[PDB]
Each structure stands twice: as C-alpha cells, then as structure tokens.
C-alpha cells in the first residue's frame, strides 16, 4: 500500500498551501479596506481646503475692489476743493504769470482726477460692475483727436505723430468711443516715452470683415528711423518692460496700461507688444466691434 | 463500492466552481483597479490645486502691495505741482480773499498729501516690510503732542480736547513713538468727526504690570455732554460705522483706520469701539511695550 | 494600487500549484487503478486454485476408497477357494499331524477373511457410505457382551477383564450398538496384547448430562499390577505406538484402530491414549449419544 | 463601496465549498484504506488455506503410500502361513485326490502373493520409491520370454499365443527390461482373460526413430477370429470396462493394470485401448527408449 499513502498525504498538503495562500490574500483584502478609507478620507479633506481657498480668493477680490472705491473717494474730497478753489481764482484780476501759476495747479489737479478715475475704474473692473457705453463711433476721428492730445509730448521729445486709416478699414462702428480713446491715448503716450527720436506711428486694419461686425487690428509702433545703436536697445528694453508689465498687471508701467488691459480684454479683444531689430517694437490691440 | 471515480471526478466538478468563481473575482479585480486610480488621479489633481491656489494668493498679495506702492508715486508727482506752485502764488501779490482762496486750496492738497503718505504705508505693511523703531519715550509727552496737534481741528468744530493719564499710569515706555502717535492722531481725528459738540477725552490706565513690561488700554471717548437726541443718534451712528470699517478693512472709515488696526497688531495689540447710551461713545486700544 | 496586482497574480501563481499537484495525483489515480486490478486478479486467481484443490482431494479419497474395495474383491475370490478346498481336505482321511497342518491353514485364512472384511469396511467409511443404525440398547450389557468375546484372548495371556459401570451412569441409550461394540472389541483386543499381565480394565462413566442426551467416556486401562520394571516399559512402550498410530493413522496398530478412530470421530467423538507411570497407560473414547 | 464588500464575501463562499467538497474526498481516501485492507486481508487468509491445502495433499500421498505397505504386511502374515503348512502337507503321504486339493491351495495361495506384491510395488510408486533399472535388452527376447510364461494360462483357455517384431523395429534398447516385462504380462494376462477363443497377437513396431532414441508402439489384441456373436458382445465389453478403469485408477481390472499405467508413464510413455466390430480390440503402449 505504498502508493495508497501518498494520495491521502498529497491532499492534505496541497489543502495546507490553499489556507497559506488564502490568508495572504485575506490581508490584501484587509489592507484594501484601510487603502480606500485614507483615499476617500484625503479627497473629502483636500475637497474642504479647495472650497476654502476658493472662498478666501473670491472675499480678498471683493474687499481688494471696495478698498480702492473707498480711496478713489477719499482723495476725490480734497480733489474738488483744490479743482474748485482754482476755478475761482481763475476767474480773479491776476497778473499773466500768476494766471500760469494757477493753469499749472490746474492741470496737475485735472491729471489727479484722471488718476483717481482710474483707480475707480480698475475698482469697477475688479468686481466686474463695469458698464461699456453703446454709441455709434468715427474710428478715423477717434485715433485722429487721440493724436492731437498727445502732439504737444511728442513735439517735447522731438517725435513726429502718424495716422493711417486704410481705405478698406471700416470706420462707422459702434461701442464705446471713450474708452476705446483711453486705451489708444495710453498707448501712443507710452510709445511716446519709449522712444527718442524718430516717428510713432499708428495704423488702423482690418483683419476680418461680416455683414454685421468688424475685427479690427490698430499698433501703435516706434519705427525707430535714425536711432544710435544706445537708443535703440533703449527702446527695445521699454517694449519688453510694457510686455511684462502687460502679464504681470501690478502697475509697473502705469495703472493706465493695466486697465488697457481690462478694458481690452471686456470688449472681447487682445493686447500685446511685437518686435524685429531692424523695424523698431509696437504695441498692438485686437477687437471685435459691430458697424453702424 | 466504485469510490475510485468519485475522487477523480470530484476533484473536476470543485474545479470547475474556482474558475466560475474567479470569473466573477476578476470582474472585481478589474473594478479595484479603476476604482483605486479614480481616487489616486483626484487626490493628486486636488493637491496640485492646493498648491497653485496657494501661490496665487501669495502672489496677489505682493501685486496689491506693489500696486498701492505704484499708485502712490503717481499720485505725488502731480499732487508736489500743487503744492509747490500754491507756495509761489501765496509769495506773490493778492487780495486778503485771493490768499484765503490759496490756504484752503493749500490745506486740501496737505490732506491728499497724508492720504497718499497713508497708501505707501499700507502698501509696506501688505508686503510685511514695516519696521518698528525701538526708541525710549514719555507717554505723557506723546499724547499731549498728538492733542496738540489736533487742536485746530477740535476747535473748528467747537469742541474740547482733554487728556488724562493717571498717577499710576507708567509713561516712561520704549518702542514706535511716531506709529503709536499716529494711531492716536488717527482715533482723536475721527472722534472729532463723529460729534457736534462736547468734549473728545483720552485717558491712559494701566491694566497690568511686571518689572520689564506695562499692560495699557488708551480710550477716545466723544462724552457727548450738551448733545440733543438728533446729534446723539448720529455720534452712535457714527461709532457703529467705524466699528464696522474696523472687522471689515476695506477703508471705509479712511485709510488710516485701516493703519491704525494693522499697526497696534503689529505691536501686540487690540482695537474697539465701545458705546453706552448715556455716556457716549469710544475709540480703545489695549497694548504692551516694555518700560525705559 | 500596489496590492491590487498581488490579487490578480496571486490566483495565477496559486493555480499553477494545482495544475502541477494534479499532474502527481493522476500519478496515484493511474497508480490504483493497477494495483487494485492486480489484487482483484489475485483474489480470483487464488480462488479458483481453493476449488481445484478441493476438487482434487475428493477425487483422491473416491479413487482410495474404489481402490480399496477393488483390492478385497480380488483377495476374495482366491482366499475363497482357498477356504473351500481346506474344508474338502478337512473332510478327507488324514492323519493327526495332517489335520493339525490343516488347522492352522484354515486359522490363517480365516484371519485373513477377517482383513480384507475391514479394508471393505475402511472403503465404506472413506466413501461416506456408512450409514449409522438407530436402535435402543444397553451399555452394560454392550460393554459386558465385548469383554466375554475376548475373555478367551484375555486369559491365554494370564490376563483379566473387569467391567464397571457405575451408578450414575446412563445405560439406556441409542445408536449403533454393533460399531459402538467393534470400536470397544479393538480397545480392549489391542489393550490385551499391550501388556504381559494383571487386568484390563473397562470404565463407564457420565461426564456431562441432559434429558436427552448423556455424554460419556469410556476408559480401556492396563493398570499393570505386578509388572517388573521392563514389563512397565515395554506396556508404556505399545500405548505411545498406539497413540502414534492414533494421529498418524497410516495402519501401523492394525486397521482395526483405524476404523475405531473412524467410527468414533463419526459418531461425534473423540479417541486417545492417557499415561502415568505408577498407574498403566489406556484408552479412552468420549461420545455423545441419546437417551432411551 | 458596493464592490468591495463582493470580493470580502466571494472568498469565504468560495472556501465554503472547498470545505464542503475535502469532506466528500475525505469520505472517498477513508473507503480506500477500508477497501485496499480487505483485498490484502483475504489475499493472505488465502495465501495461508492454499499452504495448508497443497501441506495436507502431501501428507495424505505418504500416508496413503504408508497405509498400502501395511495392508500388504497384514496380509503377508496369514499368507505365509498357508503357504507354509501347505508345503508341509505337500511333503507328506496323500492320495492323488488330496494332492490336487493341496496344489488348488497352492495356486490360490500364490496368486494372492502376487496380488499384495503389486500393493507393495504400488505403494513404492505412490511414494515416488521407485527407481528404474538401466540395463541394455533385446525386445524379441523380451516379448517371447513375456509370452512364454503366460502360454499354459493361454492353452486352458484353447487361446494361441503371437509373436510379431517386424524387421524395422530396433531390439537393441536400454531401460528397465523387468518392469517392461511386467507391463506386457499384465497386459497380455489382461487379453486372455477377455477372449473365449482365437488368437492373442502381441506387435513391436517402430514409429519414429533417431540416432540415439526409438519411438515405439506395442499392441496386444485380441483378434476374435471365430468367435460367436455372445462371445464377440463379451470381448467388447471387458475392453471397454479395462479402458474405464484405466482412466479412473482405481483398480477395477485388476492392480496390475494400475501399475502398468504408472511404469510406462513413469517412462515418459501412454497406455490406451482401441477397438474395431470386425477386427476385436487390443491394449496399446507407446513408449520412447534410448538404443544400446
Ligand atoms: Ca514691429
Ligand atoms: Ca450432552
Ligand atoms: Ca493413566
């Protein structure tokens, strides 16, 4: 009966290799009921933490934009008994020169109130309460009075002021032509401080043509004709301060430029700054606005 | 009889039930392993945007910090305009009503002037780059100063200004003279605002004291003696809303307010208003700064 | 998850132990059904060789038994004429030395009548075709009748036969009286020429008894009083030959005990031969028989 | 969780059934050890019945041997004495008449000497005893010696005696001539007592030769010639009972007919009876023997 024990032996060591295998996997299915619970433990407190974050950014943009509403009206108080007081004076017997004296204040004053307007503005902007005008517009008017307020600062820094409103480029759209005029003036005067000699020259395209609507391309650019080898890695340097400025947002060429940006970006277009060094840089504006 | 068989075909008959069973054991198996991947692609994902969203917030606090900053040097560059032509014109020759006109439009543009002087400090403080000097000084002194100075204010509106600091009062302390007087100036100035007559009156009491250190709670209380129901109504009124500008931060009391809050935590400190119908209400700030 | 591809490798690593534990237990199975095919062989090989064997002892015993019968006929038929011729010779004149030579022939062939009556008798019994009569008869008078048959033999040897049956022996049986008679005459006949002198003694007693039965022993002594030293040996000598004879049963004593030994063992009986040295050597014979 | 808790349960369902089926092949190796136990128990209870059956067959061949040769001395005893006294008369004064009585008695008596010789020759052969004699013959010789003896049995019965060794037949063997000559005797003896009339013709014949050995056939037939249709049916008969009893073995034509069947097989030969209506019936013997 030799072979008769190995039968009754083989079954009860393979049946002894089925209950060592199965308490091996009984403690991978104990080890699976802990791995899950710390899994869906973390994905429900990482899931309060973002809930939390999110709250905290949406309560620091509301009080960041009722700060500066609140400081927009704190300095507009004293503004307007500066901006008053001068009227007044203005309409007083004085000399010649104390009357250029007073149009000094004057201006710094009207210079002020368009800083604090701004400062209003981005506040505006910054809760998204702002409410873009809908007015039938001359777009070759727009950029022609944009340029005739910064021609006295580009004829101090010895600049010539170019327009060109093509013959395709459709001119009678509809939007807001004041803040449209804002966005063209802060470009242009920056340009105008970016360069030191030569023309600044703005152009006026069209990109894309409906029935109904108008995509609109318009630079501002710094041709740089004439400039030393100095100024122009001068000028290059100020257009790629602006194209950071531009993404980073914290004011760093001005708060005009980043509400540039804002307002830009609320008519559903783009801004940004190109360069070649044999052409000199530009800043650009790209905008969807329907015709009248 | 015929037992051989049965063991031969039972072992095949158990056989067949394990890959039945594990058909249904894999189905499981392969549920566990996208089931444990959904858990470890979410908790990975939500981790990331913790760390973004924390970067975000950190960043948005060093842009506002550095826009006030920006927003501040605007301002002053048109605002010292102002200011130095209205000194040229007051050393010129006007009538007695052209130089009244002069002095007001002075004292609006030195009002803007601290308000912006307020915008870059805050903007130090939002960026923790606000160093406090440590410098010996008399706490009697220092509020008799700070009332000084406010004097003018309080006597444009009738009012009187006292100060009190008890015999056990310890004033001879040590740390920021000049941002604990501009704390006081800030409270003096807005409880001047806030009645129509009566007395503003500070005390300094002594809450807790060791050898090295002095516990003080400092009060601007508007007592409101002589004041009918209409301008009683409107001192509380008045006190609630700086209350409400003091948990809530975003300047709607004045900047410097806000200052006023950020500086006496910086220092260890509190802030608060406290009213009782027939005692009028106040300004306190509780604090401790070592002594000599 | 890591413990995930442990479950699903497991089961493939626990069924390949299977696969290859199956393969050395189909090696058992294959095994058993060899080994028990060559017991179940071997169970019915020695079987038939229990039936061939059996079969051939009976034809062993009907072939002795026919052979035996064979042999008296055909001592019979010359041992007959012998017989007859010698009573023809009686019947002539003769002198007294003649007639006594006639004498002894005649006690020879008688003799030798009586022989081949017991090799039919032997042949009869070797058949089991000797059927046992059923008649009522006396123990006493059965065992006294045998010893006046050989009190002629008893007394040429200067020898005595007693009897004794006692009291509580049961006498009123039935069975065979004329074997039972034939078993005692070759007892007592060959106790007769076993000893040189004093008695033979027949002993009747109840060993065991029932309302139907009665078991009983039947003793054949020599007691042996006054034999000399060489006459105890030599009487000692023939009752251990006899018991020899007894177990081996090849005719060595004559075939008188052999049928005697037959005979009894038919009847459900027992036959042996008892010794101590200071009592004589006997016979004895143990049977059951009913009761009158 | 609802496929976690499945993987928990499908493990203890599916060892519920391993359980459940190791009980079922549990039962199946305890009925094995049952069943293999009872094949190697009667596999020994009959291996020891076959030891003791093949013990038993032994003994009772050397008993019956034994047995025999004590007959055969039981019978010599009164035999002997016959003989003797009978020879004592025979030397004694008696008439023609008693002498022919007494040479009946002699006959008779020396018949049956032969008679329990043969039981003493068969109990040699019976127990394996008997040795052959190797000693160089002439067959004619023999067989006209064998028909010599046997003419005065022949001419009582008016028979004529034959002789017939063909010219082919090799007479010069080796072997036992005595216990051939015994076989011939008997069976020629045989033959007489068969036939009431004719001839009984003995034929040595070879049947297969080699350079060392000689193959033949020896007949002893009784030819019938003038026999009546009675005597015809008679002779039949008594061959046809000799060919029984030369199959059975138990000596019903007589022992020396037995012998004869065990010398010539004890030569390695065979013995048997033919028969023809119309040519009577004869013995035949067939035997090889080696030549010189
Ligand atoms: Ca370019
Ligand atoms: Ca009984
Ligand atoms: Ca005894």
Chains 1, 2, 3, 4 share one sequence.
Do not use: C
């Not at 079954?11 to 299915?29: D, G, V």
């Not at 250029?100 to 809760?127: P, V």
């Not at 409103?165 to 105008?192: C, E, F, S």
């Not at 710094?222 to 194209?243: H, R, V």
């Amino acid at each position: 009966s030799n072979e008769l024990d190995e039968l009754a032996s083989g079954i009860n060591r393979m049946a002894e290799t089925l209950q060592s295998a199965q308490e091996e996997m009984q403690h991978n299915i104990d080890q699976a009921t802990e791995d899950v619970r710390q899994n869906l433990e973390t994905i429900e407190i990482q899931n309060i933490e973002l809930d939390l974050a999110r709250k905290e950014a949406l309560e620091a943009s509301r009080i960041k934009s009722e700060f500066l509403a609140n400081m927009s009206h704190e300095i507009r108080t004293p503004l307007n008994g500066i901006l008053g007081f001068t009227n007044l004076l203005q309409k007083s017997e004085l000399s010649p020169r104390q009357q250029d004296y007073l149009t000094t204040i004057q201006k710094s004053a009207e210079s002020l109130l368009g800083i604090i307007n701004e400062i209003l503005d981005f506040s505006k902007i910054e809760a998204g309460k702002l409410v873009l005008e809908n007015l039938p517009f001359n777009l070759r008017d727009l950029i022609q009075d944009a340029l005739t307020m910064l021609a006295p600062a580009a004829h101090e820094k010895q600049l010539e002021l170019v327009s060109l409103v093509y013959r395709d480029t459709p001119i009678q759209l509809q939007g807001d032509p004041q803040r449209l005029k804002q966005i063209l003036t802060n470009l242009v005067g920056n340009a105008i401080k970016f360069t030191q000699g030569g023309t600044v020259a703005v152009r006026a395209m069209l990109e894309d043509e409906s029935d109904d609507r108008a995509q609109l391309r318009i630079s501002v650019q710094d041709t740089g004709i004439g400039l030393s080898e100095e100024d122009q890695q001068a000028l290059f340097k100020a257009f790629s301060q602006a194209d950071n400025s531009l993404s980073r947002q914290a004011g760093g060429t001005g708060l005009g430029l980043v509400i540039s940006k804002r307002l830009i970006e609320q008519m559903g277009g783009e801004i940004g700054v190109d360069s070649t060094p044999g052409e000199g840089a530009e800043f650009w504006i790209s905008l969807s606005l329907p015709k009248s």
